[PDB]
Amino acid sequence: MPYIEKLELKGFKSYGNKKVVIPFSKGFTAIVGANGSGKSNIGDAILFVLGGLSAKAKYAEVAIYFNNEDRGFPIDEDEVVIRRRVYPDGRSSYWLNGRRATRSEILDILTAAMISPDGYNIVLQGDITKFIKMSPLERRLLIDDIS
């Protein structure tokens, strides 16, 4: 399964007009910052670009760059870049390697690489409270769905 080379943010929440580039090890990367530094917006930028939230400089943009040398994504290129920019009027557009793409096509592409904005592999603040307070019925229902 492929991996994240970097994330680029420009006009997104606390990240301003000068594009910000956030590099990641193929292994383990730790992110250190104070409460309010914008570190939690990193998790938000990732949910934004991977598509969980439908739409329903003066654009916020997030681009994520994946190394696809293992070909986990069904795309015959060594790098897969998913870019999404939200406008003031509320519109939202996506690109996949510089080409326009729809949200529905980006999701299908991520699912194919075993990635989803709803995946268990993303544990944000609030996700641990969720697991702690789940009713036993809901906890068995997660197992039904996974099975």
Binding site: M1, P2, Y3, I4, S14, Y15, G16, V20, V21, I22, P23, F24, S25, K26, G27, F28, T29, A30, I31, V32, G33, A34, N35, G36, S37, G38, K39, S40, N41, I42, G43, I46, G72, A113, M114, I115, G119, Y120, N121, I122, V123, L124, Q125, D127, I128, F131, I132, K133, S135, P136, L137, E138, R139, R140, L142, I143, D144, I146, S147
Partner: protein, 160 residues
């Protein structure tokens, strides 16, 4: 089918809980083993020197650790190419942070992990460290040594 998935995720849970909580044991228990779809799924855990209890009755730290072993067990059953954890260690008890950081470190030999943390043990084990500060946010690749001064600066202003 439900049962094959359940046993594999339960086995993962008990083994991961045991590694994160030395001398401890835990089980996911079906409320209706007979007719599983008519009952829920409880979590019972027992840290060293404690009686068995269901999740909700544990201590703050025990709850966080148990929930975390549960998510790790699901992740091991159906892995992803990357993990992103945002302050999953904040509510843990000290003694438990190191086992979490060691487990992450070893599974990272095989998958990518991005962990947002204010813990020196988490930081020290990473292949790379990124620091963020602010209004406008800024990001920088950091060495452990400067990462460690910045942490000490933050802990001073914010505590635990």
């Amino acid at each position: 089918v439900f049962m094959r998935t359940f046993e594999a995720i339960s086995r993962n849970f008990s083994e991961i809980f045991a590694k994160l909580s030395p001398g401890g044991s835990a089980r996911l228990i079906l409320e209706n083993p007979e007719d599983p779809f008519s009952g829920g799924l409880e979590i019972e855990a027992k840290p060293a020197g404690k009686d068995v209890k269901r999740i909700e009755a544990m201590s703050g730290g025990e709850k966080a650790l148990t929930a975390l072993a549960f998510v790790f067990a699901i992740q091991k059953f159906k892995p992803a190419p990357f993990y992103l954890f945002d302050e999953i260690d904040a509510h843990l008890d000290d003694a438990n942070v190191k086992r979490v950081a060691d487990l992450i470190k070893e599974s990272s030999k095989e998958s990518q992990f991005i962990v947002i943390t204010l813990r020196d043990v988490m930081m020290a084990n990473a292949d790379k460290i990124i620091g963020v500060s602010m209004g406008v946010s800024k990001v920088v690749s950091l060495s452990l040594e400067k990462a460690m001064k910045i942490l000490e600066e933050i802990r001073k202003k914010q505590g635990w």
